[PDB]
Amino acid sequence: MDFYYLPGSAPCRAVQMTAAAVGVELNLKLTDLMKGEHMKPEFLKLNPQHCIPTLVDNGFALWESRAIQIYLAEKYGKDDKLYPKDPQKRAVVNQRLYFDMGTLYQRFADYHYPQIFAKQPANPENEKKMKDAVGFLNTFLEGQEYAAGNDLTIADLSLAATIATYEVAGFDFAPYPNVAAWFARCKANAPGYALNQAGADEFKAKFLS
Amino acid sequence: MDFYYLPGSAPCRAVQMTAAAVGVELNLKLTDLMKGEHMKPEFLKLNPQHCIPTLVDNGFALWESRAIQIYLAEKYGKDDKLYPKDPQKRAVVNQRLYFDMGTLYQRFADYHYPQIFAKQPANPENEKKMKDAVGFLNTFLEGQEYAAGNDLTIADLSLAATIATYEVAGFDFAPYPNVAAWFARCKANAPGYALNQAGADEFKAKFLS
Ligand SMILES: CCCCCCSC[C@H](NC(=O)CC[C@H]([NH3+])C(=O)O)C(=O)NCC(=O)O
Ligand SMILES: CCCCCCSC[C@H](NC(=O)CC[C@H]([NH3+])C(=O)O)C(=O)NCC(=O)O
């Protein structure tokens, strides 16, 4: 299974942890967006949206990190706890996954990427929105061990990939004890977290330091 | 199943078509965001993220339209006619769902929201990104009957709710023959499309006055 990615990319790291969780080996294919590698004719033929992470499992090309996460869990996952089949349980995991992309990561990106890449002035309004995003997560975690319940799921892996990027960016998690508590839990229990930690650090040294 | 919504909302319309497709009746509860009704104490207790659509199926509160769509298909859907169980086929639908949220609808909002709710001038740069999104969809449809294959899936319902909004917004689909055709097939085969058409027409209440 070919895995086009970059350790610095949160969505890419979510997949790396998920692949570890299901014991799947990934053929790592570094794809430096900063060198336009995602725009090579070869990559465009596999993915016309030219984005990472992109997975190629025996000819089947797939992108959108969370779709890849689900695919791995359902196809190679032997334990139902990662992505439970119960509709209600699965619904909370799916809501959490969409929350991660459309709210948590999105607000992070909106607030930071303009500063990091375009060297533009920080936006106070977006900073407040980013904070509110973390607050929503703090609330979901109230009285729970993990994001979608008491079992570690792919939602936690996606959320961890994002939060680690937050941490490195310098977010102050003090006002959110549930998040802090859950984040520490993931570091200790999340399969392949080492890769997530390594990716966030690489992000810090390459585009933050 | 209490359905907190507004017809003008694309994500809400996506759920209405999906419920029509699964044969589930929704107890409609209009939630006028413009009046802060979503910020009402009681709603907040059901969904701290104060957003629509929000469904409450016999006490189980759930938001994020696409998570709701999947929940409805798996729990009440027959013959998985809208959401195949096959891992690979399901992955495409899921990737299509994430594309709808993070790219097609997201860029729509990015371009229109500031103009609609901040009456700010139109950002030509963001209009271009919005156009490329439709372009990605046009490519995905290359030689395909529907977004993720030959069968209409919840992906098509989500994409059609988003595209119906693009249409009433005056977007020009002439340069995207695959989208125009697909979209036509959706107006004619998507269960509950009439609700999508009506809600979209209502949305113009944000494009007129
Ligand atoms: C530079 C190192 C840090 C990168 C941080 C952003 S992740 C890279 C980016 N990919 C995405 O944003 C993926 C988002 C998608 N919703 C997912 O979950 O996979 C990309 O390929 N962007 C290029 C493109 O889409 O053209
Ligand atoms: C008012 C008519 C036009 C509405 C257009 C936007 S849809 C309403 C908006 N909801 C969303 O954006 C939901 C997005 C979510 N990703 C989903 O798919 O459900 C909301 O509740 N926003 C308020 C909030 O989040 O507080």
Instruction: State the Cα–Cα distance between residues A140 and A147, nearest whole angstrom.
Output: 7
Instruction: State the Cα–Cα distance between residues A171 and A165, nearest whole angstrom.
Output: 9
| Other beta carbons less than 10 A from residue A98's beta carbon | 24
Alpha-carbon gap: A159 to the closest alpha carbon of chain B (Å): 16
A1-77 has which CATH code? Answer: 3.40.30.10
Second CATH level (architecture) for the domain B78-207? Up-down Bundle (1.20)
A51 CB near ligand 1 (under 6 Å): yes
Instruction: State the Cα–Cα distance between residues B190 and A83, nearest whole angstrom.
Output: 29
Instruction: State the Cα–Cα distance between residues A188 and A194, nearest whole angstrom.
Output: 10
Q: Are B174 and B134 in contact (CB under 8 A)?
A: no
A151 CB near ligand 1 (under 6 Å): no
- Name residue B164's amino acid: A
Would you call B71 and A60 a contact, using CB atoms and an 8 Å cutoff? no
Shortest CB distance from B71 goes to which of A63, A67, A87?
A87
Ligand 2, pocket residues at CB < 6 Å: A 98, 102; B 6, 8-9, 11, 33-34, 38, 50-53, 63-66, 101, 206
Q: Are B47 and B41 in contact (CB under 8 A)?
A: no
Instruction: State the Cα–Cα distance between residues A162 and B53, nearest whole angstrom.
Output: 24
**What would the two tokens of residue A147 be?**
């994001």
Class of domain A78-208: mainly alpha
Domain positions in chain B: 1-77, 78-207
Q: Which of A64, A88, A67, A86 is nearest to A154 (CA)?
A: A67
Instruction: State the Cα–Cα distance between residues A25 and B205, nearest whole angstrom.
Output: 52
A63 contacts in chain B (CB < 8 Å): 95
Q: Cα-atom radius of gyration of chain A, to the nearest Å?
A: 17
The separation between the first and the last C-alpha atoms of chain B, rounded to the nearest angstrom, is 32
Instruction: State the Cα–Cα distance between residues A148 and A81, nearest whole angstrom.
Output: 11
Residue A125 annotated in ligand binding: no
